[PDB]
Amino acid sequence: ATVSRLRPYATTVFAEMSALATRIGAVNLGQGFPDEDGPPKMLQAAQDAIAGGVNQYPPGPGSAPLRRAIAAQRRRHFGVDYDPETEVLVTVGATEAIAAAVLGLVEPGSEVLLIEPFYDSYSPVVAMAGAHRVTVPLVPDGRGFALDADALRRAVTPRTRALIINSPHNPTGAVLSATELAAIAEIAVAANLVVITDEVYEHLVFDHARHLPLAGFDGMAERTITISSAAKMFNCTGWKIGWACGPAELIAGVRAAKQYLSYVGGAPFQPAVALALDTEDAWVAALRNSLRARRDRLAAGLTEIGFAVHDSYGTYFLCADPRPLGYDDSTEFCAALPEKVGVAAIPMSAFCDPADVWNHLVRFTFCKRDDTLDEAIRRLSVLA
Amino acid sequence: ATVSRLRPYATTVFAEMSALATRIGAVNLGQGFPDEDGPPKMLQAAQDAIAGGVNQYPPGPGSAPLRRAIAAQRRRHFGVDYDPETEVLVTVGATEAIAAAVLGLVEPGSEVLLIEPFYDSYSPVVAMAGAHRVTVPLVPDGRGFALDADALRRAVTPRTRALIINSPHNPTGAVLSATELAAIAEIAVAANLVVITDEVYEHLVFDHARHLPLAGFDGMAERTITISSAAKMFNCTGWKIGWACGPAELIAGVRAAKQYLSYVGGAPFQPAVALALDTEDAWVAALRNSLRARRDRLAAGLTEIGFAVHDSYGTYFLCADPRPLGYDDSTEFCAALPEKVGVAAIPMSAFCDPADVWNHLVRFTFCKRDDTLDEAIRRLSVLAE
Numbered sequence: 221a222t223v224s225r226l227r228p229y230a231t232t233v234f235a236e237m238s239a240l241a242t243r244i245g246a247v248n249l250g251q252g253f254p255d256e257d258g259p260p261k262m263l264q265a266a267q268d269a270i271a272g273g274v275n276q277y278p279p280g281p282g283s284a285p286l287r288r289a290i291a292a293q294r295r296r297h298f299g300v301d302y303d304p305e306t307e308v309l310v311t312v313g314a315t316e317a318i319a320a321a322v323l324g325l326v327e328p329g330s331e332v333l334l335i336e337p338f339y340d341s342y343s344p345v346v347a348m349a350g351a352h353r354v355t356v357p358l359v360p361d362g363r364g365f366a367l368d369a370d371a372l373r374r375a376v377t378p379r380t381r382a383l384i385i386n387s388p389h390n391p392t393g394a395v396l397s398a399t400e401l402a403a404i405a406e407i408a409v410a411a412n413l414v415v416i417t418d419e420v421y422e423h424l425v426f427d428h429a430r431h432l433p434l435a436g437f438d439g440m441a442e443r444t445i446t447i448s449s450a451a452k453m454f455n456c457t458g459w460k461i462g463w464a465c466g467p468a469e470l471i472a473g474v475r476a477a478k479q480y481l482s483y484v485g486g487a488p489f490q491p492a493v494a495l496a497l498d499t500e501d502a503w504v505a506a507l508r509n510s511l512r513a514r515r516d517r518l519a520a521g522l523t524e525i526g527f528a529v530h531d532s533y534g535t536y537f538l539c540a541d542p543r544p545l546g547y548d549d550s551t552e553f554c555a556a557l558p559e560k561v562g563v564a565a566i567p568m569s570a571f572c573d574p575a576d577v578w579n580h581l582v583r584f585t586f587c588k589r590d591d592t593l594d595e596a597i598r599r600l601s602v603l604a
Numbered sequence: 605a606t607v608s609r610l611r612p613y614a615t616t617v618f619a620e621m622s623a624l625a626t627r628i629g630a631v632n633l634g635q636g637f638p639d640e641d642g643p644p645k646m647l648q649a650a651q652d653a654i655a656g657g658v659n660q661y662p663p664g665p666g667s668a669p670l671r672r673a674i675a676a677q678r679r680r681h682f683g684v685d686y687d688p689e690t691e692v693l694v695t696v697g698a699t700e701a702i703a704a705a706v707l708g709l710v711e712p713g714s715e716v717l718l719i720e721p722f723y724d725s726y727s728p729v730v731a732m733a734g735a736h737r738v739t740v741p742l743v744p745d746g747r748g749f750a751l752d753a754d755a756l757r758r759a760v761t762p763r764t765r766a767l768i769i770n771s772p773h774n775p776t777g778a779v780l781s782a783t784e785l786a787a788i789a790e791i792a793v794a795a796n797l798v799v800i801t802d803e804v805y806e807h808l809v810f811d812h813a814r815h816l817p818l819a820g821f822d823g824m825a826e827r828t829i830t831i832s833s834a835a836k837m838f839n840c841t842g843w844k845i846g847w848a849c850g851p852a853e854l855i856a857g858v859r860a861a862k863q864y865l866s867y868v869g870g871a872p873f874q875p876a877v878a879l880a881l882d883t884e885d886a887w888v889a890a891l892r893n894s895l896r897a898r899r900d901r902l903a904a905g906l907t908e909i910g911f912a913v914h915d916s917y918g919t920y921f922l923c924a925d926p927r928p929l930g931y932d933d934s935t936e937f938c939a940a941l942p943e944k945v946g947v948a949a950i951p952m953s954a955f956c957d958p959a960d961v962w963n964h965l966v967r968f969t970f971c972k973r974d975d976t977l978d979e980a981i982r983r984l985s986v987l988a989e
């Protein structure tokens with residue numbers, strides 16, 4: 221039983237799916253997390269931190285070293301230069317930075333624009349704030365997807381306070397082009413919006429796609445809360461070391477909510493993640509490479525089975541269409557999948573506003589070991 | 605910088621104090637966390653968990669061993685039986701349990717009763733849910749503090765929907781008596797309240813005080829969310845393994861909000877805390893005896909200096925009054941203390957509704973290393989004139 225505005229979101233298919241798969245013994249290609257660990261020296265650092273007494277509340281905004289390391293990484297990678305003392309806030313994952321940014325910054329009654337299909341937490345967070353979700357779908361292009369900038373512009377109203385942008389994009393694996401980003405900036409500037417970007421896949425762009433933080437576009441620095449995380453970057457989704465970066469005033473509204481949601485967390489992980497950020501670029505590049513190969517590996521397998529596979533330019537997900545196999549209901553496809561076939565995936569319906577080809581798509585995860593991907597493919601092959 | 609309703613809460617003094625004292629080398633008796641670590645075997649199990657790959661999202665409601673261990677501990681200590689599958693939710697500390705329980709169960713426009721002085725997160729969490737706090741103060745009872753059940757009853761209106769109780773109590777160190785708990789129960793039932801109880805100091809009761817979980821009282825099991833944490837119980841406030849326990853439908857409401865605030869956290873700590881709950885009762889008992897001895901030392905030292913020290917029956921906090929020393933402004937006293945005296949503490953004004961004893965009290969922490977605690981007392985001794 222839950223408050224009225226959270227009722228639509230009281231359960232997710234994500235948990236019903238991972239629990240089902242877990243003791244069907246179904247290969248889980250629905251999971252939002254990796255099989256493999258982060259950098260060995262990062263794991264060791266976290267172990268040494270516990271052993272060395274780093275087990276109490278860290279400073280409210282995050283340890284100084286971790287805040288410096290985040291600013292140093294954003295500067296190193298992208299040339300955006302944040303002040304670690306006032307413009308960087310460590311959070312309990314990107315998940316908390318998202319929740320706190322909306323609760324801290326968006327007044328009840330305001331509209332928040334979402335790009336559809338959207339990550340699972342955006343709508344309920346907007347609803348928790350008492351704000352109104354307005355969704356603008358991506359459009360196919362032809363094997364991938366693209367922003368429809370005119371559609372986004374039309375969606376803005378005087379009630380729009382904020383826009384949440386997620387690139388590289390979960391679930392489609394789209395990577396917003398500079399042109400798309402420039403169009404988003406023009407709109408955000410013209411309407412005087414706050415923009416919250418969700419960049420947790422910043423390290424995962426494939427095939428000459430390039431991650432270009434929106435905060436770097438004209439007019440954007442002063443109005444963007446940029447969110448990312450160690451979760452996927454360093455394969456430590458269970459550590460929940462994320463961060464929001466932006467203008468001190470906006471970071472203060474984020475901190476204003478955040479400090480009462482968790483206060484702080486992840487004490488021994490903060491020095492370990494700071495170390496990873498400072499030192500593990502080469503490991504991250506090898507991760508990205510390993511995932512590009514696994515993407516190709518899964519795509520090739522789905523394709524040989526007879527799925528119509530869409531391009532993925534980043535993240536560790538790709539979307540595929542089972543219509544060529546004879547499966548026209550993808551929510552029912554995925555529902556039946558573990559018991560019929562012994563694989564789990566997520567239907568695209570999970571990421572879409574309840575009232576285009578979207579309803580047919582399935583999201584598959586490829587951050588699994590080689591062998592597991594292969595086994596998934598073998599199991600799925602019975603559909604042919 | 606911030607939405608209207610959180611503006612009063614945008615900054616805490618718990619921030620400006622921590623940092624003032626940290627880097628002028630003032631002994632910090634304002635802190636809300638211990639100097640020392642939890643059970644060695646719990647620390648090692650967390651390190652082992654990291655080394656063993658336990659680094660990814662745990663299950664949405666907490667790992668099964670942890671939920672089982674919470675239910676086993678609540679049974680073992682209180683004889684209360686929760687179903688670990690449906691009636692136990694692991695959260696990101698008690699703090700997130702509180703936030704998610706209010707956001708998940710309390711409708712905008714509701715009144716939420718709070719007992720003043722109150723923990724820092726209650727008021728802003730109520731505001732974030734679009735609800736209205738109604739505050740009822742404790743009253744002096746000799747050297748200690750008491751619930752005024754009549755004031756509490758009178759504070760209920762047709763729009764009251766929830767009540768947050770914290771016992772053992774931060775900041776006074778009061779521990780609600782069965783008589784007080786039973787009076788809360790009557791009120792909650794009569795007004796059909798959801799009650800959230802913050803029991804993070806469940807292990808820290810002293811002398812003849814007893815911790816009696818409110819969920820145990822008449823008509824309460826069906827309307828109560830009981831919250832606690834490994835934070836203080838096992839000296840790991842940075843690990844944020846908290847939990848909420850209660851009827852399946854209320855817990856689902858907590859989970860509904862919680863799963864979008866953090867989703868989950870603390871992966872390698874969950875097996876470690878499960879272990880500590882299952883096996884480290886002896887260590888927790890010694891910790892409690894150890895903190896009783898540090899309380900008595902602090903109280904004796906403040907008293908000898910010339911503070912009027914109040915009774916404390918639990919938590920690792922005690923309250924004292926510096927008026928007999930000649931300090932009639934305790935917010936100012938605390939502001940100047942780190943520079944003047946080399947010690948930091950929190951004034952009671954930081955726990956009161958910004959709308960008489962309270963304004964003069966100062967909360968001191970005694971979960972300090974013994975010698976650190978002695979140094980603080982030593983430092984405070986300059987105030988004897």
Ligand SMILES: [Cl-]
Nearest residue numbers: 397398399400
């Ligand atoms: Cl371009």
Ligand SMILES: [Cl-]
Nearest residue numbers: 781782783784
């Ligand atoms: Cl009694």
Ligand code: NA
Nearest residue numbers: 377378411412
């Ligand atoms: Na506008």
